């Protein structure tokens, strides 16, 4: 078996290899990349997402989110408080202010130490899930707005014809802005491109050990576990690498820099944080190997998590018993 220790793999495709997206995902998996839950792809040196990031300051963040923490340094939850709308220009100025800017630090490891020591004592502002794209329409390779759709993948594999669409989202971050422990909706893949700015650090549990993370989460958040059988779908829980180690949970970490892609694989739990002002773009996608994960995916049983219009049809076709129970 390839990659048996489930290490995060890094790939350097040539411009020739960068032409066929589906074929290169299949290649990475032939080398065992999916066993880690996450892979990094560095684009060929001739490639670019767009010519310049001039004038991105005109984009609107209609509902910025203030991320307020509760708990202890290594085990906490965060709730999102809605703030008034601001432009990306206003947001970037706020991220660079004395109150919110990245602190002095020696290297990535020093800044990671400062994040986990001090995260809970601050409330950074996150611009998340903004429908849109920053890829140039003339960019033909790995353009996250020109991928084949999950609906067409299901039709090709299973003959199923369903409603729904599939478009990218933008994320504007600052120091300490946080994404909580989660897998994707319906345990889909995701692909994430860091367009501009400071790095993003990622943590990931191998898919073959995801149930170990779930068992620890039930022990650390017991009231949340009693209220919903799939509460990590709420995307509000954080657990530090020190606590994961103390409890024997297998995981890996890596830092993504501007100009790099990250792919998460079906049922790969991940979490992380931003180092400073940045802008990323992400979308979910599917392959033939995803279908069986879609059939087995857990669902939030209490109403807190959002189920989109498109996700409704996935549940209706792949999980008809759960759909009928919803009625
Ligand atoms: O912010 C990101 O770059 C990012 C990366 C991967 N998954 C995410 N899911 C949203 C969870 C919100 O707590 C967000
Ligand atoms: Cl700090
Ligand atoms: Ni994600
Ligand atoms: Zn729930």
Curated annotation (Swiss-Prot):
It comes from the Eukaryota. The modification PolyADP-ribosyl glutamic acid is found at residues 16-17. Residues 136-302 form the JmjC domain. It is an enzyme of class 1 (oxidoreductase). The keyword Coiled coil does not apply. It is found in: Nucleus. Its EC number is 1.14.11.66. Histone demethylase that specifically demethylates 'Lys-9' of histone H3, thereby playing a central role in histone code. Does not demethylate histone H3 'Lys-4', H3 'Lys-27', H3 'Lys-36' nor H4 'Lys-20'. Demethylates both di- and trimethylated H3 'Lys-9' residue, while it has no activity on monomethylated residues. Demethylation of Lys residue generates formaldehyde and succinate. Belongs to the JHDM3 histone demethylase family. The chain holds residues 11 to 337 of 523 of the full protein. Its main location: nucleus. It catalyses: N(6),N(6),N(6)-trimethyl-L-lysyl(9)-[histone H3] + 2 2-oxoglutarate + 2 O2 = N(6)-methyl-L-lysyl(9)-[histone H3] + 2 formaldehyde + 2 succinate + 2 CO2. Its cofactor is Fe(2+). One of its GO terms (cellular component) is nucleus. It comes from Homo sapiens. Binds 1 Fe(2+) ion per subunit. Ubiquitinated via 'Lys-63'-linked ubiquitin chains. Deubiquitinated by USP14 with the help of TRIM14 leading to stabilization. GO terms for biological process: cellular response to ionizing radiation; chromatin remodeling; double-strand break repair via homologous recombination; inflammatory response; positive regulation of chromatin binding; positive regulation of double-strand break repair via nonhomologous end joining; regulation of gene expression; regulation of protein phosphorylation. Fe cation binds at residues 182, 184, 270. The lineage of its organism: Eukaryota, Metazoa, Chordata, Craniata, Vertebrata. Zn(2+) binds at residues 228, 234, 300, 302. This is Lysine-specific demethylase 4D. The keyword Nucleotidyltransferase does not apply. One of its GO terms (molecular function) is histone demethylase activity. 2-oxoglutarate binds at residues 126, 192, 200, 235.
């Amino acid at each position: 078996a390839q990659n048996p220790n489930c290490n995060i793999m890094i790939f350097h495709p040539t411009k020739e290899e960068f032409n066929d997206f589906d074929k290169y995902i299949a290649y990475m998996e032939s080398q065992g990349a999916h066993r880690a839950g996450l892979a990094k792809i560095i684009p060929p040196k001739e490639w670019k997402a767009r010519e310049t990031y001039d004038n991105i300051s005109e984009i609107l963040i209609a509902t910025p989110l203030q991320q307020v923490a509760s708990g202890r340094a290594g085990v906490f939850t965060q709730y999102h408080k809605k703030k008034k709308a601001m432009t990306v220009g206003e947001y970037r100025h706020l991220a660079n202010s004395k109150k919110y800017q990245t602190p002095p630090h020696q290297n990535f490891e020093d800044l990671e130490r400062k994040y986990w020591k001090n995260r809970i004592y601050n409330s950074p502002i996150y611009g998340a899930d903004i429908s849109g794209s920053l890829f140039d329409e003339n960019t033909k390779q790995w353009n996250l707005g020109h991928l084949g759709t999950i609906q067409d993948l299901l039709e090709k594999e299973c003959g199923v014809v369903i409603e729904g669409v599939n478009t990218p989202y933008l994320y504007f971050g600052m120091w300490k802005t946080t994404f909580a422990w989660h897998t994707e909706d319906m345990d889909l893949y995701s692909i994430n491109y860091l367009h501009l700015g400071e790095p993003k650090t990622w943590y990931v549990v191998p898919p073959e050990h995801g149930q170990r993370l779930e068992r620890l989460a039930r022990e650390l958040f017991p009231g949340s576990s009693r209220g919903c059988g799939a509460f990590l779908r709420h995307k509000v829980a954080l657990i530090s690498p020190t606590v994961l180690k103390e409890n024997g949970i297998p995981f890996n970490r890596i830092t993504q820099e501007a100009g790099e892609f990250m792919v998460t694989f079906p049922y790969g739990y991940h979490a992380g944080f931003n180092h400073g002002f940045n802008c990323a773009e992400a979308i979910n996608f599917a392959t033939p190997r995803w279908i069986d994960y879609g059939k087995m995916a857990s669902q939030c049983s209490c109403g807190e998590a959002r189920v989109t219009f498109s996700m409704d049809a996935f549940v209706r076709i792949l999980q008809p018993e759960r759909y009928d129970l919803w009625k």
